[PDB]
Symmetry: D2
Subunit: 257 residues, 4 copies
């Protein structure tokens, strides 16, 4: 496929509903060789199962909150992939209290710190740690949400973390471009995944979106997966520092009441 | 390839340097069945030659300035493609006097009229005329330039025509989405094509861009072609109403002096 | 006031509800010397009355559809105001048929032509015609709508006209800046004026906005009037080429129910 | 003046060059009653002097890094100003090592942490702490930089901090709007202040901008001061959640040589 010969690292797989799952499948469909990472013991065997379904057996632990974890992960990957062609960063976090209700009243200094560190810093942290191992022609992908551009009720500090993330896409795209590395983001529409629970009135949101979205349907991880496969293939060599909205046109329309 | 089974109409092929040429090749590479249109007698045989190189023999005349031309073209296409899956609109025009020097002093009411009619209206005009012939899952693609978003010296009224074009992408994406049609645009970086002559200090521009562009190189029609192939394939079903910048990151950086 | 000693030309006063009326009141309050134009005889006397109230007896006719009309109006204005400090462009138009329903089915070549000529070009037409009469430190102002940036139902081709006008603002600003002229636009929230009748379900829209606008209320021509007076005074010297949104925050929020 | 009867809290006055100084002068001129804070003792006396000149003797200490510091400062302020009308957040910070060179190599976890806490969170921290002391019709203001939207060399992690801060503005605005509070930011062009020394080749940058900025000159703290005074007065009632660029048009133009 259009990814044949590419060795890509996919983070964030937690379940079959995971966006990183849809991406991994698609990337695997187009012929990329995948490696995976899991956050903790809770997820290890699951990811190991999915990795094996995708012909991969490179499943390493990684908690983006620990510089040492990252470093150690990239050290284990090297042993088998001395050089690779990028990675998908499908990670994100904010303490529970954070995404519920009035942003000003919900936000706290420590939640703000955690939301940013895990959701925005982690991206560069990982690039930082594997810079040397990247082959020219490499692509780094990340996922964001409209909440970075607009104020979405309950999204709260995550909006700020995403804004921070998108800017991180630009600065990393500018600094790494000279050595063959592109860096982009997909601003996906809401999808029903593990992240759904945490957010207030989700199932209600997904119904409103479907009715007001140009394509009249919410996007699927399949959809996202295909756009991610493309963004990590040479087919997109002219795109770098870009936040591609894969939301069925939701963001460009207004008052589709 | 990822376009196999798609019947796409490609407008704008004038020469091997043409952006629509790079797109046609790529689309042909991924297995789409192409049909072409030519503006006048001057271009007919050329396009006919390229069409034949791409296994196509559907070469129809079309001058987007004539509603009747458009209608007649779509009538001839129907005879062979009763239903198709979209079209690439690689057309654009502005009288010579228009793109030279001080915008305020250069712009005139008639140049403004022509620049918009050909560069922005034509897009919807064509969708208008083939709406019925479009298969659900159809994608319409158009090409724009950064001049729509920023003020570029000498680009002058074309900036306004492009702004108009991009907005046209949104409104058409919103109205057609409900019936299976997506509409997008590629905001490409400057490429040396027939359009180069018309613009002041081009070769100088292309050198400045290469030095300040994240990927440190200007994009190629190959680059654009691949992004267009993707935007017209089901791989991008989640993207609609989007202006994807295929400019190597030029637009997201600043003062890369 | 902050406009003391400024002679500003106010276009578009049609009624006491008109955005041009609110802006005139405001600049008048702030100490600017005003001059007004009217489209035709049907509005001659009225505008003459309003001008009177605002202490002005410079009420010149002007139909922006005629370069000749513009040229002659600036001729008459010169007789009294050899040099002035800017003008407010509060004109917009699109044939009735264009504004209701499916954009793709409503939009027609002439409609698109008329929409962009009156709503977008006229702004520069006027700049062209008085460029030499403008004092250093002048400011030109125009009114846009979020329809330029997003796809709003029924706004149809007017969305493209405004997108084109907003880009007109950036080109004009970059062109005239070096000679002491700033050009800006105000993207106003929906207001109840003569534009009310001609747009499908306005009342429903003005109730939705209020509900969802951060300031929980639609803006008033007073509100816009004050941002307008500020954008044409030296208080906004550092601002040019900008589209300041005066919509109570409407556009920055998303899914506020 | 247009700020008569407003009690505004001005943060960040470090020197006569400080953007906070220009803004204070401006609001003072317009008739607002001011209160000031200083980061530490090194700046106690100075700020006390400036405040004096501006007819104010409310000079409270505040280190935005301590929720405790903020809480106590609003305690003291309450004693005299039980209810006030807004505050100017003119604070920014990132450890020296973060700002020079390749962003990817310069950025470090703590740097990123410190950058976002001081430059982005503090804005909301302060809102949180005085939310109940704010009068209806209040306005909060912050200063951003184009670095949030584009990738500027050496701005590095500060680009992400500002991106995060700009999104803070939209969330805060959507949250506090319903209670009579507007929140806006000013994206100012480069100015010569205490931020000058710490950024690589500032002088070269301030000469480039002047050359390429539509108004052909860098903005002054006076310029910003006036946009600031306007954004915190009732003249901007219809404006909230907005990032008004006060950069002489710099960001709207492209390739102006
Ligand atoms: N699904 C949606 O509706 C949606 C929409 C738009 C954007 N997003 C974004 O897509 C990404 C993936 O979300 P999803 O819906 O697939 O979520 P998911 O809940 O399935 O997985 C999130 C991943 O985050 C990982 N993670 C959290 N902390 C980590 C850390 N400390 N170290 C390593 N891994 C860590 C988890 O292991 C998890 O697998 C996020 O950036 C999210 O914001 C999701
Ligand atoms: N090449 C560049 O540097 C560049 C960069 C960005 C955007 N663009 C855009 O890409 C498109 C294609 O440009 P290109 O560089 O490949 O140009 P090109 O000069 O090779 O071809 C332009 C096409 O416009 C067509 N055209 C003009 N008037 C027409 C009409 N009346 N009816 C039918 N066809 C008509 C011509 O036949 C021509 O083939 C345009 O929209 C252009 O703005 C070009
Ligand atoms: N009403 C709103 O909520 C809204 C929202 C955002 C922006 N605006 C814009 O502000 C502007 C002011 O419109 P308005 O709502 O004040 O309504 P209005 O009916 O008062 O003003 C529109 C003006 O354009 C004038 N005009 C039209 N064609 C003319 C021509 N050929 N030459 C000269 N004058 C002509 C009309 O006489 C009229 O005075 C419009 O451009 C509108 O798009 C309106
Ligand atoms: N100088 C420019 O051209 C530029 C451009 C755009 C925006 N801005 C922004 O405007 C703001 C004002 O900066 P400035 O240029 O006026 O320089 P400055 O040196 O006058 O002000 C920065 C202020 O932040 C204060 N500060 C930092 N950490 C503190 C903390 N822990 N708690 C409380 N106060 C602390 C500093 O004392 C100082 O007064 C900054 O946020 C800056 O990013 C500056
Ligand atoms: C608690 C938590 C778990 C997982 C996430 C990931 N996430 C980020 N954004 C989102 C959402 C986008 C749309 C609706 S929820 C989810 C965020 C918070
Ligand atoms: C005269 C003319 C011929 C062809 C075009 C097409 N065109 C549109 N934009 C461009 C350019 C983008 C970058 C540099 S020139 C070319 C425009 C004008
Ligand atoms: C048919 C027509 C005539 C005049 C206008 C002027 N106009 C521009 N924008 C608007 C409106 C925006 C929001 C509500 S009305 C009105 C628009 C359409
Ligand atoms: C190290 C550091 C300390 C303080 C700042 C404050 N700051 C923010 N933005 C700026 C500047 C933008 C343009 C020129 S200086 C300075 C930035 C970096």
């Amino acid at each position: 496929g259009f990814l044949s010969g590419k060795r890509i690292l996919v983070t964030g797989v937690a379940s079959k509903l995971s966006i990183a799952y849809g991406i991994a499948q698609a990337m695997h469909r187009e012929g990329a060789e995948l490696a995976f990472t899991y956050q903790n013991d809770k997820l290890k065997g699951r990811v190991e199962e999915f990795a094996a379904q995708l012909g991969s057996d490179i499943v390493l632990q990684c908690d983006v909150a620990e510089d040492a974890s990252i470093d150690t992960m990239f050290a284990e990957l090297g042993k088998v992939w001395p050089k690779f062609d990028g990675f998908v960063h499908s990670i994100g976090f904010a303490p529970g209290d954070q995404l519920d209700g009035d942003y000003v009243n919900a936000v706290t200094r420590e939640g703000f710190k955690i939301a940013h560190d895990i959701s925005s810093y982690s991206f560069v942290a990982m690039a930082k740690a594997c810079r040397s191992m990247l082959n020219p022609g490499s692509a780094l992908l990340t996922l964001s949400y409209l909440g970075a551009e607009r104020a979405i009720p309950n999204y709260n500090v995550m909006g700020l973390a995403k804004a921070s993330l998108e800017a991180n896409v630009r600065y990393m795209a500018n600094a790494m471009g000279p050595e063959g590395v592109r860096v982009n983001a997909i601003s996906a529409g809401p999808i029903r995944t593990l992240a759904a629970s945490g957010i207030k009135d989700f199932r209600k949101m997904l119904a409103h979106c479907e009715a007001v979205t140009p394509i009249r349907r919410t996007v699927t991880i399949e959809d996202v997966g295909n756009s991610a496969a493309f963004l990590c293939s040479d087919l997109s060599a002219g795109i770098s520092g870009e936040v591609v909205h894969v939301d069925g046109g939701f963001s460009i329309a207004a008052m589709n009441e």
